[PDB]
Design a protein around this motif. Structure first.
Motif, PDB file in Angstrom:
ATOM      1  N   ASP D  16       0.839  -1.191   0.000  1.00 54.80           N
ATOM      2  CA  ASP D  16       0.000   0.000   0.000  1.00 54.80           C
ATOM      3  C   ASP D  16       0.877   1.245   0.000  1.00 54.80           C
ATOM      4  OD1 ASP D  16      -2.385  -1.441   0.052  1.00 54.80           O
ATOM      5  OD2 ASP D  16      -2.413  -1.522   2.245  1.00 54.80           O
ATOM      6  N   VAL D  27       3.273   5.132   3.525  1.00 58.63           N
ATOM      7  CA  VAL D  27       3.250   3.838   2.852  1.00 58.63           C
ATOM      8  C   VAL D  27       3.045   2.759   3.903  1.00 58.63           C
ATOM      9  CG1 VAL D  27       4.583   2.217   1.435  1.00 58.63           C
ATOM     10  CG2 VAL D  27       4.704   4.678   0.990  1.00 58.63           C
ATOM     11  N   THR D  28       2.203   1.779   3.589  1.00 55.12           N
ATOM     12  CA  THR D  28       1.843   0.730   4.528  1.00 55.12           C
ATOM     13  C   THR D  28       1.991  -0.635   3.874  1.00 55.12           C
ATOM     14  OG1 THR D  28       0.185   2.267   5.399  1.00 55.12           O
ATOM     15  CG2 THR D  28       0.153   0.004   6.233  1.00 55.12           C
ATOM     16  N   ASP D  29       2.290  -1.633   4.700  1.00 52.79           N
ATOM     17  CA  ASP D  29       2.393  -3.021   4.267  1.00 52.79           C
ATOM     18  C   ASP D  29       1.095  -3.743   4.598  1.00 52.79           C
ATOM     19  OD1 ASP D  29       3.113  -5.528   3.470  1.00 52.79           O
ATOM     20  OD2 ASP D  29       4.564  -5.878   5.081  1.00 52.79           O
TER      21      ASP D  29
END
Lengths: 50, 50, 50, 50, 50
Positions: D16, D27-29
């Motif tokens: 993401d 930003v994300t996992d």
């Protein structure tokens, strides 16, 4: 710093991003010229470019 | 390590297994919890309280 | 897909998320029309004089 | 172009990214707290001086 | 199965269930009325805010 070395005060443009538990963020807030507002993915780049 | 069974709001089931470091504050966990749910910051699915 | 959302990644588009379908018969005389918006998607349509 | 399209599909299917709420970068996992993403980027006129 | 890295590991597809030692909730559409109030008076007996 961008290598991983110490980001001294003069390492202004020389650092990594900033992590969180599940997420990371780059910390500089990109602002469209004059707008004081912010861009979208589908926004062309020239509006900010120095 | 943490081991899990979960079932989703639609209803589909899922198990999970993940590591835990000793100094995990609940906030650290509550940061993973979003990813663990699929409750991504980009798309919420649930709201939590302690 | 239309990708006027400025992507060249037209997966973000109407067609990805909804689709339409017509039908009419050639040997009995039946006719129908159908549309399909996929999960996560509600849709509405508006007119200019049509 | 399509074989690149799948590479992006992997990105969409895996991670993401976001142009965050005030034009910074967030930003994300999809799965993790501990996830090994690290970035350092430089501009043509980063650094040096007269 | 292992490892169970913080890059959380997952499995899916447990398909049905009949009776389980499972989560807990106070909210729903439907009702049981008198016993529920009796259950709530039990909370008065136990003093259960929780």
């Amino acid at each position: 710093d961008t290598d991983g070395n110490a980001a001294n005060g003069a390492d202004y443009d020389n650092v990594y991003f900033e992590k969180n538990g599940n997420t990371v963020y780059g910390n500089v807030s990109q602002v469209i010229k004059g707008s004081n507002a912010y861009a979208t993915d589908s926004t062309k780049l020239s509006e900010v470019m120095a | 390590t943490l081991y899990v069974q979960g079932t989703k709001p639609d209803g589909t089931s899922f198990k999970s297994a993940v590591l835990v470091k000793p100094e995990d504050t609940l906030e650290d966990v509550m940061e993973n919890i979003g990813a663990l749910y699929g409750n991504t910051p980009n798309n919420k699915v649930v709201e939590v309280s302690m | 897909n239309t990708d006027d959302n400025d992507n060249k990644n037209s997966n973000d588009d109407v067609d990805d998320h909804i689709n339409a379908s017509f039908s009419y018969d050639a040997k009995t005389g039946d006719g129908l029309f159908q549309i399909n918006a996929k999960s996560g998607f509600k849709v509405a349509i508006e007119d200019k004089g049509t | 172009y399509t074989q690149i399209q799948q590479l992006m599909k992997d990105s969409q299917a895996t991670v993401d990214v976001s142009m965050d709420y005030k034009g910074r970068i967030s930003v994300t996992d999809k799965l993790s707290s501990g996830t090994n993403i690290e970035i350092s980027l430089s501009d043509s006129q980063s650094g040096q001086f007269p | 199965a292992p490892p169970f890295t913080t890059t959380s590991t997952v499995q899916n597809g447990p398909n049905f269930s009949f009776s389980a030692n499972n989560s807990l909730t106070i909210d729903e559409p439907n009702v049981d009325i008198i016993k529920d109030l009796d259950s709530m008076i039990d909370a008065v007996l136990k003093g259960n805010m929780r």
